[PDB]
Design a binder for these strands. Structure first.
Ligand SMILES: [Mg+2]
Ligand SMILES: [Mg+2]
Ligand SMILES: [Mg+2]
Ligand SMILES: [Mg+2]
Ligand SMILES: [Mg+2]
Ligand SMILES: [Mg+2]
Ligand SMILES: [Mg+2]
Ligand SMILES: [Mg+2]
Ligand SMILES: [Mg+2]
Ligand SMILES: [Mg+2]
Ligand SMILES: [Mg+2]
Ligand SMILES: [Mg+2]
Ligand SMILES: [Mg+2]
Ligand SMILES: [Mg+2]
Ligand SMILES: [Mg+2]
Ligand SMILES: [Mg+2]
Ligand SMILES: [Mg+2]
Ligand SMILES: [Mg+2]
Ligand SMILES: [Mg+2]
Ligand SMILES: [Mg+2]
Ligand SMILES: [Mg+2]
Ligand SMILES: [Mg+2]
Ligand SMILES: [Mg+2]
Ligand SMILES: [Mg+2]
Ligand SMILES: [Mg+2]
Ligand SMILES: [Mg+2]
Ligand SMILES: [Mg+2]
Ligand SMILES: [Mg+2]
Ligand SMILES: [Mg+2]
Ligand SMILES: [Mg+2]
Ligand SMILES: [Mg+2]
Ligand SMILES: [Mg+2]
Ligand SMILES: [Mg+2]
Ligand SMILES: [Mg+2]
Ligand SMILES: [Mg+2]
Ligand SMILES: [Mg+2]
Ligand SMILES: [Mg+2]
Ligand SMILES: [Mg+2]
Ligand SMILES: [Mg+2]
Ligand SMILES: [Mg+2]
Ligand SMILES: [Mg+2]
Ligand SMILES: [Mg+2]
Ligand SMILES: [Zn+2]
Lengths: 83, 232
RNA sequence: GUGUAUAUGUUACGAAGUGUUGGAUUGUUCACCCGGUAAUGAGGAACGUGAGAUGGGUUUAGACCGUCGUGAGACAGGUU
RNA sequence: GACCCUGUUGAGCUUGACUUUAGUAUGUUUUAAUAAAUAUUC
RNA sequence: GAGGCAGUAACAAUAUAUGUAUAGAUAUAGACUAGGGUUUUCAAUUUAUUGAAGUGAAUCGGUGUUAUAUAAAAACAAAAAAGAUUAAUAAUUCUUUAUUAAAUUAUUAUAAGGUAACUUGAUAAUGACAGUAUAUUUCAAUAAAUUUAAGAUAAAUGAAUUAAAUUUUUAACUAUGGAUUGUCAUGAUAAGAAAUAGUUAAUUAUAUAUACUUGAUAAAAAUAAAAUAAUUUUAACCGUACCUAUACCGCAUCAGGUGUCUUUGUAUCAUAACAAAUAUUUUAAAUUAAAGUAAGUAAGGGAAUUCGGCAAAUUAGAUCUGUAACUUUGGGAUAAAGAUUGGCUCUAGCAUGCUAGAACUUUUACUAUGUAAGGAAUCUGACUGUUUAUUAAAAACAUAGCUUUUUGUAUUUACAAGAAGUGAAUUCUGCCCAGUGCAUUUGUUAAAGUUGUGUAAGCGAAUGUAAACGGCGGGAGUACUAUGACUCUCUUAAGGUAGCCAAAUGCCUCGUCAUUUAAUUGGUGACGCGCAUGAAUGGAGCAACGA
RNA sequence: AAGAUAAGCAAGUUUAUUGGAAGACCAUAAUCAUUCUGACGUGCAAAUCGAUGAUUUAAGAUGUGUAUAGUGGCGAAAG
């Protein structure tokens, strides 16, 4: 609450530039977020390794992207298989 | 002079070369069914591997995009095409994404190994039984059919989004990948160690474009360039 | 002596007894201002004096800019 | 004597100094037999 | 082999009339490994010389397994502790109570019980694996009480000081149940909460449970069975003394260097300092030199000394008010600037040892030890980091960021693997392919072979390429004086655009104007025909940071 | 700094707590070598001593084992 527009990138302090800290705020928001489990339906999916997403309740691992749970190039190739 | 850095790095690779996995899938005559067991992580590479189980035998494979533990996949020359299945090349329609292509039949796999990089199919030619693929590098290569491949985009996403904002982040990258880091520019060196070295100011004094005609120890700089500079 | 009425000067002869002292800028010697007094005179002694001192410049090996040389490199051109 | 000069005395380094060489590119000759097609000379 | 200088420089030098004692003085101390090898202990003769004696293992090390074709006395692995003895060894000798393995004896269950989790002789398990933060207070230690003992005071003291021992519910799972409930924090549940009944355990601080950082996800191999009692000239080979700095290495009894662990009391954040414990140690003079190496104090003036405030001095802990220009909106900031602080006797809160307020009193209170001088500007490097062991710590190197190039037959597979230049962010990156290089494509030129004849790459020519090496002129007239928007003209590959300056880059030069001072070759702000400024051989720019 | 809870005002927005991220700030033991151009300079010493300084959870410090040899090796680059 204490920060006006920096957000999660306030740990870096007053270094590395201005636009380098903008690029950190996009990625670090989607990494630390928790998501819904596709199997059990609960919101407990977290990331622990690059490319591995696992749930706390049902304990089932999912493959995925580096920093997001789903990839924008990953979802377009699901639509063309549905037709 | 002395032996420079480039030749001294290659002979350091003969004393202790780098080690990786090279994962390949088996060959089976008819369509079988297998189950995904677990997902792991290796030292050098970024893309996670997967352990599948065909006929009570556990192999290793590159994980596709949507894959969870306990799912069932099929392997064969005539399997149905969906996410994670492995079929022949002639069955897939034009426009999809495949990520392990063997050059010849009954081989493990050659093309599309890393994470985030995929290829596309552009056509089929019923005369001479050939299909043209679109490589990730951007070049159209003509492939013979009857090779088998896996359907889908590989995992691990776009790693190149966030930068190494610190120097310490790039230290652990090059150390795991067995490369030399940090690197010193060749202008700072004395003229024993490198051809560009020495002088009163830091400058080159020689043209940096070097032909490929010359012998192996003379190759440095931009080797055999067709063009140099910003286009626009 | 005088183009010496007094005051204030200027020139010449004898004379080395005693004085000739404070600061801003520059590595300075030289230079030029402020303040003062009876008057900030010119010089020598291995261009007095480093087993008396200090080490600012000049003058080994690090490094930067400018000019010359295709290059290693150079400069009584400027810096640390 | 490290500065300076002489010696038909040396060494590290560069290059459009003189003389050459590892590597590499391209010819010719050596290359399993068989049948057929095509071209060039007579 | 032996002189002068020369008995000169340079080093060592505690008190007692009677003593195996009473005092003074300096230094923390003790164990495993690497190195040393008899220095250990005793006797005799004067840190010496000779002579004897001394090292005891089924459970303490090695001998065993391996680190992806010779590797571990700190990784892995069958098993013990007290209490005494010798001039010197003691988890090894002796007494007492235990444990492991192998060979021979005596005896025998082949399954019961619970709805369930599970209980009893009734096999097939593992060695085996990052870092940080918080919450538990297990032990242990303090504190209190009690019981035996000790040492001192001219006196006095509700009974002081020292030693030994005795004491001070939670997590999973099962059965009913049908919708709520927890932690210092994040929560958990129709894939069954609270509440009941029950079955397992509670890992001893190098532990348990959670959370957090990562393009780093955190070794190998040898290795397994079980009930009760008994026996043994059954358990091989090697090392077990002593020293941790006057018993190692530096030619030495050298102010240097050398892996790990343990160590008592006061100490209201700690630190610093002092005291315990333990080990060493014997005898010249003195109110008096000069000049040295250290430590102190100073009337009046306050940088006038000097290349330069070099050396020294001032500030400082904690509580309460208060806080600017600038900015990359995070910072600047502990900015700057003020006020308070002892001792004793009480009052008031609840969390019970911490915090506010009040009265009395004095040659007034963090200051024994420890503990930031502050502000305003300019040049250069973005930052944390590294470097010439022994004259250079920096503006040099590195770094993320930006850009160019080669490879689709990689034990590895283009978000990959090799080769180069600039150097965070913001804003920009102008013109030239004539020269030298680089790439692509259709006149001259060797040998060998065939009766004889013919055929190579390369060089040359054409087309692209400057974030490849590099380069980016001069003269004449023309609107009271003055200047030249405008015009003419030699050539060339193109004739320095956006910007910036007597700057770390300007010879003449101590350039011209303003300002800073009593006075300036210094500093800052403006001017430009720039000896010889200028765009990734990067130009312009300062917020944060700087021995 | 994220994350979380309450009390106000009325899609939101002020105030107070809890929490403990960062190549953030400061000290002891340990480490290094800026200044006095201090001491010593046939020295304690073939590079030492004193005061003053810089440094802190990491691109750190250190024991042992295996690999790299002289026209050769290693190098955050000073020959
Ligand atoms: Mg250099
Ligand atoms: Mg060379
Ligand atoms: Mg440069
Ligand atoms: Mg003279
Ligand atoms: Mg003289
Ligand atoms: Mg002298
Ligand atoms: Mg003299
Ligand atoms: Mg000097
Ligand atoms: Mg040049
Ligand atoms: Mg010079
Ligand atoms: Mg001659
Ligand atoms: Mg020679
Ligand atoms: Mg003496
Ligand atoms: Mg003896
Ligand atoms: Mg003993
Ligand atoms: Mg004993
Ligand atoms: Mg012993
Ligand atoms: Mg012993
Ligand atoms: Mg030792
Ligand atoms: Mg010693
Ligand atoms: Mg005296
Ligand atoms: Mg005084
Ligand atoms: Mg006074
Ligand atoms: Mg002065
Ligand atoms: Mg003076
Ligand atoms: Mg000082
Ligand atoms: Mg008071
Ligand atoms: Mg720096
Ligand atoms: Mg040095
Ligand atoms: Mg430094
Ligand atoms: Mg130094
Ligand atoms: Mg640099
Ligand atoms: Mg930049
Ligand atoms: Mg050209
Ligand atoms: Mg062009
Ligand atoms: Mg111009
Ligand atoms: Mg400038
Ligand atoms: Mg002036
Ligand atoms: Mg820090
Ligand atoms: Mg000195
Ligand atoms: Mg050898
Ligand atoms: Mg040099
Ligand atoms: Zn789930």
């Amino acid at each position: 609450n204490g920060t006006k527009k920096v957000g999660i990138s306030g740990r870096f302090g007053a270094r590395y530039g201005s636009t380098l800290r903008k690029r950190m705020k996009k990625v670090l928001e989607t990494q630390k977020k928790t998501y819904e489990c596709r199997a059990c339906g609960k919101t407990s999916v977290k990331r622990d390794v690059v490319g591995i997403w696992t749930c706390r309740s049902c304990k089932i691992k999912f493959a995925g992207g580096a920093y997001a749970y789903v990839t924008p190039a990953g979802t377009t190739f699901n639509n063309m298989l549905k037709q | 002079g002395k032996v420079t850095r480039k030749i001294r790095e290659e002979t350091k690779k003969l004393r202790n070369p780098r080690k990786l996995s090279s994962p390949k899938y088996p060959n089976f005559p008819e369509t079988t069914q297998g189950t995904v067991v677990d997902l792991v992580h290796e030292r050098g590479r970024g893309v996670p591997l997967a352990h599948v189980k065909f006929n009570d035998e556990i192999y290793s494979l590159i994980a596709t995009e949507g894959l969870y533990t306990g799912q069932t996949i099929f392997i064969g020359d005539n399997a149905p095409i969906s996410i994670g299945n492995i079929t022949k090349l002639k069955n897939v329609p034009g426009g999809m994404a495949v990520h392990s292509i063997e050059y010849d039949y009954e081989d493990g796999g050659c093309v599309g190994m890393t994470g985030g990089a995929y290829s596309t199919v552009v056509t089929h030619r019923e005369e001479t039984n050939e299909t043209v693929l679109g490589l990730p590098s951007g070049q159209k290569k003509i492939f013979s059919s009857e090779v088998r491949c896996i359907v889908g985009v590989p995992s691990a996403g776009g790693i190149k989004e966030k930068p190494f904002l610190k120097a310490s982040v790039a230290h652990y990258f090059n150390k795991a990948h067995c490369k030399k880091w940090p690197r010193v520019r060749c202008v700072a060196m004395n003229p024993v160690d490198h051809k560009f070295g020495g002088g009163n100011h830091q400058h080159v004094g020689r043209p940096t474009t070097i032909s490929k005609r010359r012998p192996h120890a003379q190759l440095m700089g931009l080797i055999g360039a067709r063009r140099t500079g910003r286009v626009k």
